[PDB]
Design a protein around this ligand. Sequence first.
Ligand SMILES: Cn1sc(=O)n(Cc2ccccc2)c1=O
Ligand SMILES: *[C@@H]1O[C@H](CO)[C@@H](O)[C@H](O)[C@H]1NC(C)=O
Length: 344
Amino acid sequence: DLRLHLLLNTSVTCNDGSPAGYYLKESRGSRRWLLFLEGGWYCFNRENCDSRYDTMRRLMSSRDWPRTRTGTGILSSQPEENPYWWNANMVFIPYCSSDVWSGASSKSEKNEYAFMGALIIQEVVRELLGRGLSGAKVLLLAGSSAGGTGVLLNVDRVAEQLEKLGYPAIQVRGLADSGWFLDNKQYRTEAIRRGIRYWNGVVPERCRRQFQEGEEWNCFFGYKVYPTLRSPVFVVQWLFDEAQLTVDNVHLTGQPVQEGLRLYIQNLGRELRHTLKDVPASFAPACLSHEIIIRSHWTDVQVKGTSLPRALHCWDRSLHPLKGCPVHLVDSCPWPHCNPSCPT
Ligand SMILES: Cn1sc(=O)n(Cc2ccccc2)c1=O
Ligand SMILES: *[C@@H]1O[C@H](CO)[C@@H](O)[C@H](O)[C@H]1NC(C)=O
């Protein structure tokens, strides 16, 4: 189990003004630290955020959080479940800012909600330095869904923070799971643009300088922000991601898929594969699914005979090509479940 700690700086808050926090399990014999960002969509105006507060309140408030949480998948401490990093120090950061981890705005007389995701990450890192992070050799910032996009938006800021604080020896890296989306045409971007204004959202500096004022929404799309980043980032993305298909208005019912939808789905997979061609650390199976790294059976899927925990181990070796230890693993077959190892 990982144990809850509420932030000592109580000005860094969830949406409703309650303190943000993190869950921690220390591993005294390890200099590896894994910090995982939870996902869970977002909200982008007063009415939409009010609705989320009625029925998704744990994603907006710490008042009802439990004292402990069980680590699963990459957060498990058992080697059978986690062949990659089972002995690491484990941190789960709850998503309670509804801002894709981008916000820097407090609750006040003018703002019904606080959007502080970018500041929550920085404050967690600062408070962990007194609990052993100061001795780390590697800090892996990981995340799923909105948390995977959050990795892309925040990994270089964590690296800059540790450099300015006097810890240049800590190697900061990212692992973005299910957060690499396409700004494509629907089968049958404005919400992000609205959200950034509502949240006072912030994006990485080099990407901001390319796209300039009013166009910062572009930096939420992986294929546009990734080339601007300096820290090493491993990208995990299903080729037929269920969240991508939902926003594209695609719903599979079991009836025969006709030609127009067949071509739409095939072109989506081809476009995703194209955006990953120049991403040297990546894992992209031809499956219809969403999220993987904190699932207990994350060990089961393979691309070209290599599992995700193996690919991450090969990535670690590469950061010290490798015979029999690949790091770039993208399926080429063109339809969901053409890979036999896809989740059932
Ligand atoms: C395909 N999809 S899915 C989704 O949620 N969005 C909006 C969004 C984009 C980047 C980061 C967070 C949210 C898309 O364009
Ligand atoms: C608490 O957090 C706020 C917001 O990031 C910051 O302005 C302030 O300096 C912090 N205070 C301390 C003591 O860390």
